[model samples]
Target chain A: RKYFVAANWKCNGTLESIKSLTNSFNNLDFDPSKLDVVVFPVSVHYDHTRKLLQSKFSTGIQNVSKFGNGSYTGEVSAEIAKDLNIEYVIIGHSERRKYFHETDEDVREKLQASLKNNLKAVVCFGESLEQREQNKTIEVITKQVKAFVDLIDNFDNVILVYEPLWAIGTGKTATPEQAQLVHKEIRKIVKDTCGEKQANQIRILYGGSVNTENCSSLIQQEDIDGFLVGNASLKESFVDIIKSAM
Target chain B: ARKYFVAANWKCNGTLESIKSLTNSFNNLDFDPSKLDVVVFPVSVHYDHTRKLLQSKFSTGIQNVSKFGNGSYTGEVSAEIAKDLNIEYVIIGHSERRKYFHETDEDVREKLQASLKNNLKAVVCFGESLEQREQNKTIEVITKQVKAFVDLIDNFDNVILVYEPLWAIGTGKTATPEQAQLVHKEIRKIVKDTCGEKQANQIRILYGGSVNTENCSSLIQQEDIDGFLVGNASLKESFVDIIKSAM
Candidate 1:
């Protein structure tokens, strides 16, 4: 199976930073034929970065609104993304969940909307530190997966991201073994909810403090098909991490 | 003492082509700047382009801004960035935001503070919903909304108020001149009570909701209505008529 490496730029970067980074991406000698790569920029910068990249890399939005295109102030809808040629949209990200009060139902609706507009949904879900401590990671993942799985009309264009709350931006990471277990459970949940064919078709990624150092081992895991990288994705080393994934 | 001000809030509307078209139209539109001030608020994505195309000629604003300065708040634009981009104004506490995003009075307060700290002027909005208007709670609703601004800012120098009756917005139900006058007069009273008669008389209160060229003259003629916050009519040629009406 082909590996996918997605970058979550999470509320960071200015015009200068974006230009600088995209410059790095353009000059990079990485072969796109080996693995799939995507970058989620802040919505305001989506079009500008898309033009700057010139199709050397793929781009995505940090969020997509549930509504299509009316009076929803401060929201960028999937239709707008499609019009702008934005290829992917990250939905139900942990930061969005914690800060914006996005619920499972909200995520489901946004996912449906994204798919309707032909934008791929990088749907994210994971247990909080407390839930993990309580040994409820599997239960949380299963429930989150079911919420989207039931709503998904087309399964080919969607991807799931497992981001542990404690590991995100806290400089903590789940060991390759730990991440593989959860990813395996997530695939099983998808298989049970959708089917065996889709389970193998859909790519599940491990997110949260994923760095160049840990990416090799993480990518080696049976279930860890890719990474939804955060902070590391903002730097030049991001190319190294992507290379390591291959 | 207050100058007539008209702001076109193109909420969740406009594309790159729309911006190019509007910018070209705006350049040719004739309005006496000394008589009235005009501001256009586009979606954040268009701000950079709009600024590049039309600078100093017309002021531009963001539809919304986050309460915080920066960091890890996905899908949010902050005041610091707005200031850096030289954005002149921001719209706060629109009814749509309150209804859809659950933006509370406290959130508005924080947003106002953010704007004030960054030296960006704020066109704060307050409105009475259909139910509140029917219940004759217009005064109650407007008072509660204005209190947040009063408590947060000592001076109203960088603030403009828009009284958009929720029942009228996007419903093509324009509030009668007398009705808008009553609400604007009530808002002036709150300003008077908080900042005294001088500030009240100097403060500009704009009437919003389905304002068009036909009704624009009557609304601008109201004693208490200093200006207008044009909505749907903003995107059309009627916006120019509204500005000319101010003169």
Candidate 2:
């Protein structure tokens, strides 16, 4: 499988801040030919950030409007993402749904919009603590997977992100075994929804609390293709995380 | 009076290929910018995208502006930052804020103040909620909203009023020109009362709410209605047609 990892620069970085980090991150000496890496910034800095980073890294938009460019005001459309030379987009991330009222249908709209614009999407899905407390982790992931997969006409432009909502941003971490089970369920869903060929071809990533210490163990999982890294991606640990893939 | 202002809020659609083609098409348009203030309101994400490819003579507008001039508002673009980058017009309040984000009259007041203070043109929005309209309080609701700014700004010429009825915005429904004329007249009355007759008449009033190429001509025909704050149709070539329709 193609190893795909992404950094979500959630609510962080200004033009100056991004300018300072871009050079260091750009010069990190990672062999781009071996890995597919992307950095997503807030919408305001999408262009400045993309220009700041050379061809060694790719750029993605954190959120995009699923609707076409007519009346639905205040949304950043997916077509704009395509216009900006954005190669990937992070859709329906946990924050987008929990804080911004993004729904499954909305996520589906974003995916369709991305596909229509010929941009790849990092489709995010995960379960809450309440759902997991009742031992419904599999059921929750299954439903999310089903909702997203059923809404799609194709998965050729998708990268599934298995982000357990409960584990995101909080200091709490999910053990390697815990993430592997979710990854296993995701791969199975892909197999069932898109078929065996797509299931194997799709890159399933583990997100939430990913760091240098845990990347290797998480990457060791057969179904865990890579990571959708967050906080750690902003630090020196990113270099260590990238090195672990070797 | 400078003819009028028309802007397309291409809320979120465009690819580099699309912008390239659209910009090339726009150059063929035969409208006098000196008489008309024409612009395309690309979403915040597409500022550079359009900047990279747009070759047309028309200016650009941005969808959202932050309340606080500059700080950590997480995912917000402020007037200061926008001014620094040479943004011309900043869209203040659309129904999306009143609907999805719960923005209030006071929020609009602060943003309008900031925009005027920074010397940027304010597309100050006014409208009635469904409940307010059903109570037959469209005029009253709009009166109170516009009154907030009329009482604040020293110059009305720098500020443009965009009346977007809450119920019609993004719903594909619109108020008829005759019906819109009554509200526009009433708004002019409010302006005359609060600011003065000259400033009141000088302030350009644009009708926004599901504005499209199909209906913009009739809407623009209303004497009080100067132009439009168009929604989805802004993202396509039809935007130029809407702007030049007054010609």
Candidate 3:
């Protein structure tokens, strides 16, 4: 299986910084034959970044609307993303659920919308710091993941990114063992819901403050397939993280 | 005094191809920019391309902006970014946003502040839904909504008011020219109460919903009706006729 390294540039960067980032992507010497690298920029700059990239580097939208097409002002639908040749869409990130009140049902609707338009869904879910302390980490992860797994039978076009809210942008991370535990649980949930064959096929990524120093150990785990890099992905170390998968 | 203005809210419609076609259509039309102003609020994906496509001839804006400035607010376009891109206007507190998204008076106020800070003009929208209109609460509802902004801004210099009745939008219904004029006059009075007569007259009040080439002439001829905030008819050649009606 080819490892995937996805960058979530959530609500950051300017046109100039984007240009510099594009420069890095254009000059970086990495074999596309080894692993996949995808970047998720905000909706306004998706087309701009797509126009600038000079490599086989893939691109995804950070979010998509549950509603499709007309009459929903301030929303970019999956149909528009597909028309723009966008490949992947991240759904139900904790920030969206916290800030925009996106519920599990909403995430399911958006996932269906993305898949209907033939775009991959990088569906995200994880427990908060409080839930983890309460020993409800497993429960919370199960409920959230089941929302997607129950809604759809196929997991071929879906990628699960487990982002513990406490670690996101807080400079904390789940240790390699901690991350592997959750990944193992998530795969089992998929195995039970779908089957062992499909479970092994799905790529589950670990997110929240993943850095170049820690990525090698994390990717070496049995279940930890790749990463959804947040803060570190905006820097040169991101290229190192991508190389770790090789 | 403000020139007559018309804004087409291509709310969540159009692809790259459709936008290219619309650009060609828009370029073919003729209207003296001195006599009238026009703005198109495309979905965020189309803003940059549209800005490059139609530079000074026509203006482009985003449908919504984040209440926050920048950083960590996923899926939000900031007013600062809009200004950096040379975008001229932003539509705030549209009924679609108010009804679907939980944008409150506080949210609208913060958004307006963001636009003002970045030197981006605001097209602020307020209107009475059918339930409120049937209950004869048009004045009361509008007064309450306008008070949110009126209390915050020191001047109404760069603000344009769009009155889009909830029942009329997407229902193919429009307020009669008389009904529209009454609401426009009342809004002007609200502005006059706060900023005085000169400010009231200088600000433009637009009537939205079901405005088309057929009814635009009558609506634009109204004494207080400055222009239109078109919806369904915005995507068609009829939009040119609406702009012509303004001239």
Candidate 4:
């Protein structure tokens, strides 16, 4: 399976810094014959980043409007992403859920819109600290993922990024075992919901504290197909993390 | 003291082809810039492209800015980023944002402060809902909305106020010029109480909610109705006529 390393820049960077980062991406020393690299920048910089990239890589928006175009001011819809040649959209990131109050219904609608517009979706799913401590980790993840999984006809344009709320910037971190276990459950559920043939092809990424140091072990697991990188994606070390997959 | 401020809120609309088409249509515009000020508030994704394609006389703006600065706030764009892109104007507190995204008064206040901090001009929008207007609470609702950010203002040099009634916006129902002017006068009264006479008089107040080419001329005639905050008509050739009305 080809390893995918998706960068979630998450409201970071400027034109100058992005130019440098693009340079790093363009000049990556390793051949990505078995890897796919997609960068998710804030939509404001989409035009700028789309132009400066001289590499054979894909680009995505950090978010998409749950609502379609028109009258929903300040929103970027799936159509907007497709219009700009963006390949993937990161939907329902825990930050969007916690900060912006995105509901599962909103995620469902956004997923449908992405598929309707033919843009790939990087749908994020996982549980919070309280829910996991309550022994509902799989239940919460299943609920979030099931709604989206049911809506899609195929997983070809869909990627699930498992980012536990507790592991994100919190003192507690998910070990490679812990993350792989979740991915294992996710794949099982995908098989149960869809089919064995479909489940085997669906890519599940581990987010939450993923970095250059831990990516190697996580990518070794059967279900941890790749990573959805956070803070490190904006730094020079991001180069090291993607190369680790190779 | 201020020129007619005609703003077209593209509002979560447009693609590359249409942006190119609209900017091309808008470039052929003819008007006295001294008598009118025009800006298009496109979705943030199109800010750079719109700015590059739009004419020198016309300015491009962002639909929203984050209440917080740049960080790990996923999918949120900060006013600093807009400034970094050389964007000068932002539309804060639109009713659509309030209704759909659950933007509160405090949220709008933070956004306004961010815009000011970044030296970006804010086209702040506030409006009464249909039920509130029906209950004759237009003044009460508007006063509260304006008060949300009134304390953040020292002057109007970097801000513009738009009164978009929730029921009228995108409903194809516009307030009669007299009705819109009455609310504009009350809005100015709230401003004058805190900002004093000179600044209050100088502050430009524009009327929104279903403003179009047909009614724009009469609306601009109102003493307090400085210009229009256009919605649907902005995407059409009639927008040129609306600009002419403001001119």
Query: What lDDT tens digits, residue by residue, belong to model 3 across residues A14-99?
Result: 78888888778677777767777899887788778888876678898888888888888788899988888889899988888887
Q: What is the lDDT of residue B235 in candidate 2?
A: 64
Most accurate candidate by lDDT: 4
lDDT of 4 by residue, A1-246 (tens): 677899888888899999999887887765546678888888888878888875566788989988888888889988887887788899989889988989999999999999999999899988988898899999999899888788767676788899878776667878889988999999999999989988888899997887778889999998998899988899878978888888
RMSD over all Cα atoms, model 3 = 1.9
* TM-score preference between candidates 1 and 4, better one: 4
Report clash pairs, candidate 2: A69-B232, A70-B231, A70-B232, A71-B232, A77-B12, A79-B14, A83-B15, A83-B16
Pairs that collide, model 3: none
Model 3's lDDT to the true fold?
Answer: 0.83
Q: Is candidate 3 or candidate 4 better by TM-score?
A: 4
Candidate 4 chain B, run of 10 with poorest lDDT? B165-174
Report how far off residue A193 is in candidate 4 (Å).
Answer: 0.4
State the lDDT of candidate 2 residue by residue for A45-87, as single tens digits: 7778887888978788777777766455567766656655678
Instruction: List the candidate 2 regions with Cα displacement exceeding 4 Å.
Output: A76-85, A150-156, A169-171, A192-198, A235-237, B1-4, B11-38, B43-45, B52-58, B65-88, B92-135, B140-160, B165-178, B188-204, B209-227, B230-247
Which ranking of candidates, highest lDDT first? 4, 3, 1, 2
The candidates, ranked best first by DockQ, are 4, 3, 1, 2
- Candidate models: Cα lDDT each: 0.81, 0.76, 0.83, 0.86
What TM-score do all the candidates reach, one by one? Answer: 0.91, 0.75, 0.95, 0.97
Q: Residue A31 in model 4: shift from native, Å?
A: 4.7
